[PDB]
Amino acid sequence: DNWRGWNIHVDGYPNTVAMDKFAELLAVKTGGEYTLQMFHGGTLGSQPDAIEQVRAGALEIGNFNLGPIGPLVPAANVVSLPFIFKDVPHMFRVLDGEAGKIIAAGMAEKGIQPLAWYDAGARSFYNGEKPINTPADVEGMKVRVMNNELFTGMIAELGGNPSPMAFAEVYQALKTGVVDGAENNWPSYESTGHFEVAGFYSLSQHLIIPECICINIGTFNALSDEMKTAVLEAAQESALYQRDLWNKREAASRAAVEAAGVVVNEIADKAPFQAAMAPVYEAYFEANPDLRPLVELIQATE
């Protein structure tokens, strides 16, 4: 009845405050029959490890980015395709439609039930050496990515050298030059300290990946109908709050790092970055023929 949950983020981060709210709302709506203890800051382990713990039932709850879920769940892997959404509002429109049900089904199929969707904005490149404006600027650059071969591909097609690595280890790696750069949204770039050791941020906005509040499906299925309704309502309400927190944080984060001296650039012509992803998309299609229509469905959505 007393659950444990994972979140990788630090204090005050939108996801952190929102998962606390999820835990609070779970206890309220279930009259104390179900409670949740959060372990924030990744103190329970890396994201892939936590995903395995939730799937195995060693942990009940996670706030997981879908990036590291992709290698486990083909349908979820669709949101890890570079340049598949035009922007965050587009993503949410796609997720509240048929794409979302398919992604959820695929997830539930691998033992992990999404309960609500969180915003994590768009991810963009950052490094300590120079601005990125064209794919040529990425050639030879060692860029850290999350643990998903779609992202190793993305970097290789821009001529970089990908380095999949745990999020926790990125600050040191940038500090010592083991990697040259990485990529993420404004709040992560700011909260982890990466901006202090990688002060060029280039708005490629190459990935727009949602997150979820995740529950082990056995845990969820064992609930009564009314408790499932309570858990879903808590999750959904936490996520609406998270989305409000998120939009204020993106601006505050961006402003704080610009003030600290970060040099920001837009990418005027993103088209060559997109064009270079042909082989990554085509290589997902070859691995997952059945899911070509999921990709087309998303790209067809306004």
Ligand X SMILES: O=C(O)[C@H]1O[C@@H](O)[C@H](O)[C@@H](O)[C@@H]1O
- For ligand X, the binding residues (CB under 6 A) are 8, 47, 65, 120, 146, 167, 184-185, 188
Nearer to ligand X, 185 or 205 (CB): 185
Under the binding rule (CB under 5 A), the answer on residue 188 touching Cl ion is no
Sign of the dihedral through C-alpha 145, 150, 155, 156: positive
Distances in Å between the Cα of 88 and the Cα atoms of 73, 85, 207, 289 are 22, 7, 10, 26
When CB distances are held under 5 to 8 angstroms depending on the partner's kind, the choice from ligand X, Cl ion, none that residue 152 binds is none
Under the binding rule (CB under 5 A), the answer on residue 167 touching Cl ion is yes
Q: How far apart, in whole angstroms, are the C-alpha atoms of residue 207 and residue 258?
A: 22
Nearer to ligand X, 80 or 185 (CB): 185
Nearer to ligand X, 65 or 113 (CB): 65
Nearer to Cl ion, 30 or 188 (CB): 188
Under the binding rule (CB under 5 A), the answer on residue 46 touching Cl ion is yes
CA angle 30, 35, 38 (to 5 degrees): 140
When CB distances are held under 5 to 8 angstroms depending on the partner's kind, the choice from Cl ion, ligand X, none that residue 46 binds is Cl ion
For Cl ion, which stretch binds (CB under 5 A), given 46-54, 72-80, 133-141, 281-289? 46-54
CB 263 to ligand X: min, Å = 21
When CB distances are held under 5 to 8 angstroms depending on the partner's kind, the choice from Cl ion, ligand X, none that residue 120 binds is ligand X
Under the binding rule (CB under 5 A), the answer on residue 47 touching Cl ion is yes
Instruction: Count interface residues toward Cl ion (CB under 5 A).
Output: 4
Nearer to ligand X, 122 or 230 (CB): 122
Q: Is 185 annotated as a binding residue?
A: yes
Q: Contact positions toward Cl ion, by CB under 5 A? A: 46-47, 166-167
Annotated binding residues for beta-D-glucuronate, written as ranges, equal 47, 123, 144, 184-185, 211
Annotated binding residues, written as ranges, equal 47, 123, 144, 184-185, 211
